[PDB]
Structures are given as structure tokens and as C-alpha cells.
């Protein structure tokens, strides 16, 4: 994940370590960087 | 074995020449990743002191065994006996950002702080001898030859441990000068 280098099932539950996440029913600046037109516009030579 | 001699091609005569036989060799203690894994104290040390090695004594077990190789790449392990917060910066960083308390900063503990900082210089493998004209004597190894700098208030002792060391291009090791007496006699 983040900086965390621990290699073990952490002691405390996720519920008590971090705050849980709700959902309703992404990463736009990577979609932008991927969608970028690389290369040329005219005929090479 | 009456070899060509001049060819300097490696020749290793066994003891099987005079009817004696060659025994079993267990060469662990003369390994490279093993002989450099011990702690080599750096003296004298003070605040705003770089953790770059070669400041190890030339004659120490880890100083001479290191200067016996031109190029050496290893992961440094530090042990510092400081008196305040000990800030450490990577290989290339402004000496101004030395104590911003955002760079790894080990808070003073009762015993010396022991860190395992990585090898961060941009080069492939550092060098013990550079033989290079002054960038843009020879006393000077490039500034990027360090493992980063530490600045605690009053640093009292500094030890250094080269993990996973790799030495290249061996050099002279130069055992102690003997004068008049046959053996050194210590």
C-alpha cells in the first residue's frame, strides 16, 4: 500500500486500525497520462 | 610445474607433486559478503558528518579489505550514538534540507540509533580510487560517492556495516612493514 513494509497479518483488525469505507451503487490523472497522443502527425521520412 | 611463466596465466601447483595429497578447504571466513558484514567505527565523527565510507581507517579489517578493491557496491547499516534527533538525507540533497524533520530522523533513544539505510548514489558501483581531473589533484572522490549525510547535535560515535557487499577489481593489501627482524614478533 503506502510506505508500510510490514509482512504479517497485522495484529488489530482493519476496523480498529483504519476507518472503514462505505460505497455507493477512476484515477483520472492516470487516464489522462495514458490517453496522451505520442508520435508524429505527418508523414515521416 | 615449469609453466611458461611470462604468460602470467594462473598456475596453481597442488601438493600431489611429491606424493602428498591436497586436503579439503572451507573458505568461509575469507569471503567478501562475510568479511565486510561487521561494524567498522568511523573516527573522528561530529555533527553534520557525511556517512560516506573510506573514512574508515586504512588499516582496519573493513577499511583495508575495502581499499583492496577499486569498485565496491554495498547496502550500508548505521549505528550512531547521538544526543539529539539524527536526520539523514539521501546521496544527493541540499545541505540546507539536512534537518527539515521530513527526512528519516531517528529520535534519540537510550542506546545508539541503529538504521539500515540503502545505497542511494546514482552510480553503478562506487569507487575507492577515482583517478579523475577536478570536475568542471586526485584527493577528490566525486561528491555523489557518499551514502548520505547525518546531522545530530553532538554525534559521539558512528559505526558502519556494509550489507551484501560486492567488491570489484582487487588492489594491493599491504601488510605491516617488517624491519631487521625475520618475523614481526607481536
Amino acid at each position: 500500500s503506502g510506505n508500510t513494509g510490514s509482512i504479517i497479518n497485522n495484529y488489530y483488525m482493519q476496523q480498529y486500525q483504519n476507518s472503514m469505507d462505505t460505497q455507493l451503487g477512476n484515477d483520472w490523472f492516470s487516464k489522462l497520462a495514458s490517453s496522451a497522443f505520442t508520435g508524429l502527425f505527418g508523414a515521416l521520412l | 610445474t615449469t609453466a611458461t611463466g611470462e604468460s602470467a596465466d594462473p598456475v596453481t601447483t597442488t601438493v600431489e607433486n611429491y606424493g602428498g595429497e591436497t586436503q579439503v578447504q572451507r573458505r568461509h571466513h575469507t569471503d567478501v559478503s562475510f568479511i565486510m558484514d561487521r561494524f567498522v567505527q568511523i573516527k573522528p565523527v561530529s555533527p553534520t558528518h557525511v556517512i560516506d565510507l573510506m573514512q574508515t581507517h586504512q588499516h582496519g579489517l573493513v577499511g583495508a579489505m575495502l581499499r583492496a578493491a577499486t569498485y565496491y557496491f554495498s547496502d550500508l547499516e548505521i549505528v550512531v550514538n547521538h544526543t539529539g534527533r539524527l536526520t539523514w538525507v539521501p546521496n544527493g540533497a541540499p545541505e540546507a534540507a539536512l534537518d527539515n524533520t521530513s527526512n528519516p530522523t531517528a529520535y534519540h533513544k537510550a542506546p545508539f540509533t541503529r538504521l539500515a539505510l540503502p545505497y542511494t548514489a546514482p552510480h553503478r558501483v562506487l569507487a575507492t580510487v577515482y583517478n579523475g581531473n577536478s570536475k568542471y589533484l586526485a584527493a577528490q572522490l566525486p561528491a555523489s560517492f557518499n551514502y548520505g549525510a547525518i546531522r545530530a547535535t553532538e554525534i559521539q560515535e558512528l559505526l558502519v556495516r556494509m550489507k551484501r557487499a560486492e567488491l570489484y577489481c582487487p588492489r594491493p593489501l599491504l601488510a605491516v612493514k617488517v624491519t631487521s627482524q625475520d618475523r614481526h614478533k607481536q
Binding site: - | 611470462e6 604468460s7 602470467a8 570536475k135 570489484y168 599491504l174
Partner: protein, 206 residues
């Protein structure tokens, strides 16, 4: 035991060879690196041999009289032009040292290529054999051939700022001259740069 080494369009033939001593490798390492970004172009016209004079092997010279040559040395040839026009380049040193001897004069001369050469304290001269090296003796072989792969802290090193390989010749045994033998043994070299890659084209003066 003849040996016809040939670099580029120039070849050297010796009839007293004693073999070739590759130092630290049998082949050069990958010439493609992230720093170059595939902008490095190999030059095959820089492999031509060049002859450089070395200290004369007088009888008076004592053991330990090292006469190192910095590599790369000033070059007025095609290789020299590349150093001037290219910021970064890498090559194999391939130093060849031949000292003509009458063969009736007995002496021992050790030629070794020392990477990152540092002035010796005269106690490391005995331990100077731990490098790619060959021994030049009039009794056995008058020519010593050493091939060394380019090795440096960076994949490409600017030659003007720093030189990785320096050729050093040491008088292991003082030359002894018989009446029949040569009274002085000049020493010459045949260096050739091998696997010359260049990158970073520089601006011009023309």
C-alpha cells in the same frame, strides 16, 4: 608461436607471443543503458591501432621504476576526433607493449593495465601483479598483449574529466646487458580502442 592480432584495418604480427591476457572479463558488458536512452552509436573507424613511445629500458634503471601511460592518451587520429565531438564514449583498452631485445641480455619487465591508477607508495609495487598483466622478457617474449574490457562508475565516462585505464610498465628485474645484447631497450605500445560507443553529439568549431 606467431600471433596476428588485427584491429580494424591495421594489424600487428609478432613471432614471440606468449598469449593474450584478458583483464576482468572475456567480453564487454551491455553497451545499452537507461542514461544513453538508445542515443549511443558504435564507431568502427576508431579501432585503428596507434603507436605511443614509452620510457627507454636503460640498464641503470632500478626495480620499481614505473612508467604509466594515461588512457585515453592524446589522439590526433579518428578516435581523437570522436572525443572532441562526442561528450560521452566507452571502449576496451587493448594495450599492447613490445620492447625489442637482442635476447642475449637478461631482464624482466612487467606491463600491467591498472584501472583508476593511483601513485604507488613503493610497497604496493610487489602487490602490483594483482591486475590484468603480462611479463616482457628478452629471453622469452619481446611483446606483451593485454586486452581489458572498459569498466567505470558510470556506463559512459567523459574522457577529458576522467580516464579509467592507465598502462603501467615496471622493471621487476633490472636489465642486464651482455656485449652481444642491446645496450638500451626502447619500449613502444600499440593501443587500440575496442567497442567504441559514443553518445551526446557536441556543437562544432568549423
Amino acid at each position: 608461436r606467431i600471433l596476428t592480432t588485427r584491429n580494424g584495418h591495421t594489424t600487428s604480427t609478432t613471432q614471440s607471443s606468449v598469449g593474450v591476457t584478458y583483464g576482468y572479463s572475456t567480453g564487454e558488458d551491455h553497451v545499452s543503458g537507461p542514461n544513453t536512452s538508445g542515443l549511443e552509436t558504435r564507431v568502427v573507424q576508431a579501432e585503428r591501432f596507434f603507436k605511443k613511445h614509452l620510457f627507454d629500458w636503460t640498464t641503470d634503471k632500478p626495480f620499481g621504476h614505473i612508467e604509466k601511460l594515461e588512457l585515453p592518451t592524446d589522439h590526433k587520429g579518428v578516435y581523437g576526433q570522436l572525443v572532441d565531438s562526442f561528450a560521452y564514449m566507452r571502449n576496451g583498452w587493448d594495450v599492447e607493449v613490445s620492447a625489442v631485445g637482442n635476447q642475449f641480455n637478461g631482464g624482466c619487465l612487467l606491463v600491467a593495465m591498472v584501472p583508476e591508477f593511483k601513485e604507488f607508495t613503493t610497497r604496493e609495487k610487489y602487490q602490483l601483479t594483482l591486475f590484468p598483466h603480462q611479463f616482457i622478457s628478452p629471453r622469452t617474449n619481446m611483446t606483451a598483449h593485454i586486452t581489458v574490457p572498459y569498466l567505470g562508475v558510470n556506463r559512459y565516462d567523459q574522457y577529458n574529466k576522467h580516464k579509467p585505464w592507465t598502462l603501467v610498465v615496471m622493471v621487476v628485474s633490472p636489465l642486464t646487458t651482455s656485449s652481444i645484447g642491446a645496450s638500451q631497450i626502447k619500449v613502444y605500445t600499440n593501443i587500440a580502442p575496442t567497442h567504441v560507443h559514443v553518445a551526446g553529439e557536441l556543437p562544432s568549431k568549423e
